[PDB]
Task: inverse folding
């Protein structure tokens, strides 16, 4: 394969993951919230910037393992292929971002193992 | 900081638009990044999904891009990915944007 | 600012070394990232990239307590190529200053 | 193909590109200097050096287009290796963001 766009996204599980057994095998999907932060001089702390939302998809053993491990609020690191999609929702054409995950882990920077 | 960086190799898909804003020069263009896969039952590369991005540049990058980029040009773009749902200009309120740090004509193609 | 970000999926290759400094906790460990290619009718190992991974603050504390040799991990951080010339003889090594580390749910 | 480490490096050509006649075909290599900068105006931090390799049309084009000092964007596969950090380049371009 060529010219896939890889992404690594560090964020929080934003929806309860959904597991489905398909003919092609196990599948899991969840929403991931990735919030950029910037250092404020006027407040002397980190302040939230833009939040990117992604729909994260996993398959095979990653799906099976994720289905037992991930819950809303969990800080995670996700690596995978970015897919920018256009679809109709509430009768409007809208662009959205999917990550076809290759690796997912609970982020040790923001929680214990 | 938790910005999502992206490096995208694709083609300029729309004629770039240059705008002089109060904040300085700005350029935007659409970038088409098409994945390809090797076909065994045929010979060559076959096209998969195309990711479309709106690429934004400012300052010197905008000034230089405005004189250099045209539809069809193969380019390499590095920048910050912004998946947007509150766009207040143009005809769509959603976008997948790249706020470009670096852009170059791709010498591979 | 021109930092080079990297995301590496590999295995912990050395026991992490944890140091409690006055400036805060620090940890380092070696990470092995092995490329694989299809076909023997399976995956075969290609080149292994070795990195020294560094972390600080809560990430150092948490990684120290949870990582052991062999563990599959995903690491995101800043790549630093360290080049040390002595007597015209140059020793290069690749460091990752980690922002995020997790046990990889794909392989465990 | 699995678990290759991609990277995108934005830096300056540090050595004149040179030709290598490999068994896999004609190739070009050059040294790339990637210097992080931090705001105080900008001050230089650590410089990462890579050996960048290209083949086929990318090599031919790079050989005719690149010179020492040129700001460039390089995308490719990182190979940490006599030791070195190599990038097997997929895309190289002159960076429109910068001046020599």
Result:
């Amino acid at each position: 394969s060529m010219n896939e766009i890889m992404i690594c996204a560090v964020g929080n599980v934003a929806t309860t993951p959904v597991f489905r057994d398909l003919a092609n095998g196990p599948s899991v999907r969840f929403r991931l919230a990735v919030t950029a932060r910037y250092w404020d001089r006027e407040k002397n702390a980190w302040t939230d910037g833009h939040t990117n939302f992604f729909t994260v998809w996993a398959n095979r053993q990653l799906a099976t393992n994720a289905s037992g491990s991930l819950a809303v609020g969990d800080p995670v690191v996700v690596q995978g292929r970015l897919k920018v999609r256009t679809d109709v929702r509430e009768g409007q054409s809208r662009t959205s971002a999917d990550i076809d995950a290759v690796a997912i882990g609970h982020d040790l920077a923001r929680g214990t193992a």
